[PDB]
Amino acid sequence: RSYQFWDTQPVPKLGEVVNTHGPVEPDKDNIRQEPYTLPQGFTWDALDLGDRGVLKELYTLLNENYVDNMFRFDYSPEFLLWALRPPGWLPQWHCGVRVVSSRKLVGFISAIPANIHIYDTEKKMVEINFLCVHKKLRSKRVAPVLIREITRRVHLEGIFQAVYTAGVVLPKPVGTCRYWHRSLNPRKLIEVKFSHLSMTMQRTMKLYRLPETPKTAGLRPMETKDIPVVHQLLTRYLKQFHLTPVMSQEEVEHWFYPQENIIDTFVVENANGEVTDFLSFYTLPSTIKSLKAAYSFYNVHTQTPLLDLMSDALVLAKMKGFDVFNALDLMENKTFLEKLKFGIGDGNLQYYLYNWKCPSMGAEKVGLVLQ
Ligand SMILES: CCCCCCCCCCCCCC(=O)SCCNC(=O)CCNC(=O)[C@H](O)C(C)(C)COP(=O)(O)OP(=O)(O)OC[C@H]1O[C@@H](n2cnc3c(N)ncnc32)[C@H](O)[C@@H]1OP(=O)(O)O
Ligand SMILES: N[C@@H](CCCC[NH3+])C(=O)O
Numbered sequence: 001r002s003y004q005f006w007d008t009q010p011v012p013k014l015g016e017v018v019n020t021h022g023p024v025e026p027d028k029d030n031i032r033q034e035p036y037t038l039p040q041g042f043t044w045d046a047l048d049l050g051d052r053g054v055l056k057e058l059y060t061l062l063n064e065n066y067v068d069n070m071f072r073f074d075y076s077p078e079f080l081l082w083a084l085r086p087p088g089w090l091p092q093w094h095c096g097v098r099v100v101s102s103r104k105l106v107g108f109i110s111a112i113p114a115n116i117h118i119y120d121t122e123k124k125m126v127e128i129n130f131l132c133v134h135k136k137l138r139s140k141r142v143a144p145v146l147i148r149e150i151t152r153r154v155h156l157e158g159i160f161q162a163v164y165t166a167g168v169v170l171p172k173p174v175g176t177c178r179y180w181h182r183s184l185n186p187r188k189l190i191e192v193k194f195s196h197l198s199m200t201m202q203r204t205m206k207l208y209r210l211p212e213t214p215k216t217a218g219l220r221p222m223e224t225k226d227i228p229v230v231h232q233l234l235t236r237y238l239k240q241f242h243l244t245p246v247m248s249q250e251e252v253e254h255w256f257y258p259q260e261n262i263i264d265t266f267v268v269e270n271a272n273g274e275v276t277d278f279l280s281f282y283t284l285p286s287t288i289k290s291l292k293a294a295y296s297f298y299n300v301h302t303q304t305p306l307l308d309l310m311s312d313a314l315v316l317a318k319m320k321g322f323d324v325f326n327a328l329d330l331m332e333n334k335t336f337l338e339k340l341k342f343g344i345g346d347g348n349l350q351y352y353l354y355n356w357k358c359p360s361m362g363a364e365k366v367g368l369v370l371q
Contacts (some may be wrong), residue, residue: 241367
């Protein structure tokens with residue numbers, strides 16, 4: 001295969017086996033000050049997402065041009081503020097491309113800062129998300145310019161490694177995960193053709209029926225007082241994997257404190273009053289009118305069996321009106337996916353590091369979930 005752009009980047013080649021650990025190129029001690037040249041008639045713009053009108057341009061750009069062409073992500077403004085303004089976010093890392101004459105938003109890419117644990121190293125990186133080019137500008141080499149410009153802007157802040165994911169295979173995946181789906185409203189999914197029959201319709205609704213209330217004693221929504229223990233449980237739980245975030249307590253609050261229609265977190269508080277487990281999933285609908293999906297986030301278990309935790313996750317999602325519950329085969333999720341009646345999806349998710357050469361890993365050692 002020929003990768004015009006990626007062959008010029010500090011990433012391992014596809015097919016080269018990696019047995020080393022470390023950067024591909026050194027930290028840069030002088031950085032291009034000038035933005036990379038866009039095609040004529042387009043210009044860079046850093047998007048102030050605290051401007052409601054500018055945020056509305058971005059979700060319009062994303063809702064209409066982002067990821068069989070039946071279902072498109074329907075990102076909401078409030079979800080985007082959550083994904084794009086975690087602790088340490090920078091406005092110049094909300095990199096947008098506008099038509100010069102009309103100022104219409106036609107491309108975007110974002111970086112947010114994360115401390116990343118990869119094997120035996122902890123490194124300050126960025127996470128790259130929401131790379132989007134208007135359908136009209138496609139195959140005009142604008143995506144590589146966006147990648148180069150966000151790289152430049154991240155170098156300016158002294159950061160030289162990134163993590164990112166993609167559905168397509170690029171040089172070179174550190175890990176490969178697969179999406180799985182758990183029908184919660186089987187009628188609706190079959191109607192809008194997201195799932196198909198295998199077996200009567202009546203048999204299917206019984207097959208997927210869930211309890212009306214969770215079975216775990218002491219389950220309840222996360223509260224402000226749970227922020228420390230949630231942070232402690234997560235940090236300890238993540239040590240067993242090989243690619244994980246290292247979150248501060250403020251980061252834990254941002255990513256797990258519940259926000260309606262964005263992020264749900266439930267903790268298990270036992271008969272002694274100690275929080276010993278939590279489950280979490282985010283909300284991301286897709287346009288078809290709409291398909292309400294929940295996405296498995298981070299699920300930590302120390303006293304409740306993981307199979308019971310996720311069973312409760314499905315139940316709460318069902319109760320909250322979601323149509324489907326999605327989850328990757330990473331961390332220990334393979335231990336519950338089949339038993340809890342998930343079906344395997346058709347889309348992969350490849351995980352990548354920029355400027356870090358290291359052996360690849362099984363899905364089960366990936367302990368990092370992005371939005
Ligand atoms: C230290 C800091 C480092 C920070 C930077 C780290 C790197 C960040 C990398 C980005 C992380 C984003 C992660 C998530 O957000 S992935 C989200 C992906 N976005 C979508 O799927 C939304 C719908 N698609 C689009 O909006 C466009 O089709 C996109 C923008 C995807 C491509 O636009 P376009 O269709 O008009 O193509 P082109 O003619 O301009 O250019 C083609 C070149 O671009 C390479 N390409 C195509 N798709 C992707 C992709 N998803 N990741 C990386 N590279 C990609 C491709 O291999 C080819 O290079 P090469 O094959 O010749 O080598
Ligand atoms: N969800 C798809 C998956 C196809 C095969 C994916 N490995 C189906 O069962 O129709």
